[PDB]
């Protein structure tokens, strides 16, 4: 019988839960309505940096992830300062719904 051909995950949406440490969430975000897009014409919010061995890294967040929701509140159409505020106010466990195109 013929060899199995492995599957290929092309893209995903996933929810990562970051446990805030004294230093913060261990990420930078970039983007926002009216701002210079992080990617193409997409004015959304993206994870632009992930601190090595910080909380986000341990939670499985990756640079390039598009940040769709913070604790269930959608960031679609948000300005940069609004996304920063959502994240700073998200409490101890921060559920991050992201879109990941690079596997």
């Amino acid at each position: 019988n013929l060899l199995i051909e492995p599957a290929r995950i092309e893209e995903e949406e996933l929810t990562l839960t970051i446990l805030r440490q004294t230093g913060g969430l261990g990420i930078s975000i970039a983007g926002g309505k009216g701002s210079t897009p992080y990617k193409g014409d997409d004015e959304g919010i993206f994870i632009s940096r992930v601190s090595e061995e910080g909380p986000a890294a341990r939670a499985g967040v990756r640079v390039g992830d598009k940040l769709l929701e913070v604790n269930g509140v959608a960031l679609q159409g948000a300005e940069h300062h609004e996304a920063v505020e959502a994240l700073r106010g998200a409490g101890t466990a921060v559920q991050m719904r992201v879109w990941r195109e690079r596997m």
Binding site: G24, L25, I27, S28, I29, A30, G31, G32, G34, S35, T36, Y38, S48, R49, H80, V84, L87, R88
Partner: peptide, 8 residues
């Protein structure tokens, strides 16, 4: 306009 990036 600016590229906006913030550590959180």
């Amino acid at each position: 306009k600016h590229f906006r990036e913030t550590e959180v």
